[PDB]
Design a binder for this molecule. Structure first.
Ligand SMILES: *[C@@H]1O[C@H](CO)[C@@H](O[C@@H]2O[C@H](CO)[C@@H](O)[C@H](O)[C@H]2NC(C)=O)[C@H](O)[C@H]1NC(C)=O
Lengths: 48, 186, 124
């Protein structure tokens, strides 16, 4: 059915959009928090 | 005996070390004379009252939120199907897994729980209600399969049963499938 | 602690938005999300012998763990919305003209391609 096929592709495009969006959030949260903590740890270690 | 008080109250708190779980609200002092129960003489007693309040942020962020999220996710999963005209899955394994996951969290963080038999704390009342609706939910999901499988016998639903179904649907916000409309037309 | 949870969250994110066939019904994905939450909840509180366990503030490690939980919980709801959109084709109403117009331009940037059977339906 052409109607079923059209809605099938809409969900396929929407699914890949979610995949790209959710990896950007994961990269920012995981890398950003840990890198910020390391920077604080590094400065106090070498400035004291 | 007589008490000696400070500027801020009966008990000095100017050099108190802050606690990570309790906060001090105030202090009181009271001097009382008590009678011996064998002699006509008195003795003096000093009473010091300390009021402390718990900080619930750790418990709120560590126990209440994950269980509430898991219960909502399980509720959504229980009553969602991919196709209207298709056989549904058991849903029993999902309910058991949800109960197993929630049972793991409550008793393995139980190092800090009250564990008292005198009364039911507020956190205990919250946990029981989540368990019942999950347990009731797994039985309600099983009853949907039993109703759907009634069509294999060959007896059509009663006229009043179908009449009530068509009026709840607009409020429920559900729509008839295309293949069902075609069957009526044929 | 940090590495295993980050690996598990990434694996779950990949699993949430991956399908074997474009023109096929998808699975629930609810069990995968619950299992991921159960696995992550096991690690945080059973290694909690060394965690701060303080109510004065939110430590750096605590902030990291909450964010992973929300995106997993949000991810399981986003995966469920894809099924709801796909099942809209059983009603028989074609998507709106503007809905299909927007879909065809995001796809080249998204790097997705139309299936062969969909092209044949248009030709017929
Ligand atoms: C020992 O303490 C008692 C506490 O009750 C004192 O009793 C008081 O006695 C006076 C008269 O001497 C009454 O006016 C008060 O009403 C009593 N107190 C109460 C609370 O009723 C008693 O005086 C004290 N001294 C003794 C027994 O030698």
């Amino acid at each position: 059915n052409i109607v079923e096929l059209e809605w099938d592709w809409v969900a396929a495009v929407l699914e890949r959009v979610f995949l790209i969006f959710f990896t950007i959030c994961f990269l920012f949260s995981a890398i950003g928090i840990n890198l910020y903590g390391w920077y604080i740890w590094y400065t106090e270690n070498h400035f004291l | 005996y007589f008490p000696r008080t400070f500027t801020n109250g009966p008990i000095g708190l100017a050099n108190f070390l802050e606690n990570d779980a309790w906060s001090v609200l105030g202090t009181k002092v009271n001097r009382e004379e008590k009678k011996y129960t064998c002699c006509p003489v008195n003795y003096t007693l000093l009473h010091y009252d300390v009021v402390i309040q718990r900080k619930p942020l750790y418990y709120v962020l560590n126990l209440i939120a994950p269980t509430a999220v898991i219960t909502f996710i399980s509720i959504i999963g229980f009553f969602t199907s991919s196709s209207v005209h298709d056989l549904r899955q058991e849903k029993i394994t999902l309910g058991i897994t949800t109960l197993l996951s929630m049972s793991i969290m409550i008793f393995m963080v139980s190092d800090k729980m009250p564990s008292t038999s005198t009364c039911v704390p507020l956190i205990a009342l919250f946990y029981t209600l989540m368990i019942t609706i999950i347990s009731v939910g797994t039985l309600a999901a099983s009853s949907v399969i039993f109703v759907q499988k009634l069509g294999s016998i060959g007896n059509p639903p009663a006229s009043k049963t179908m009449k009530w179904t068509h009026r709840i649907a607009p409020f429920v916000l559900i729509q008839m499938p295309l293949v069902m409309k075609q069957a009526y037309a044929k």
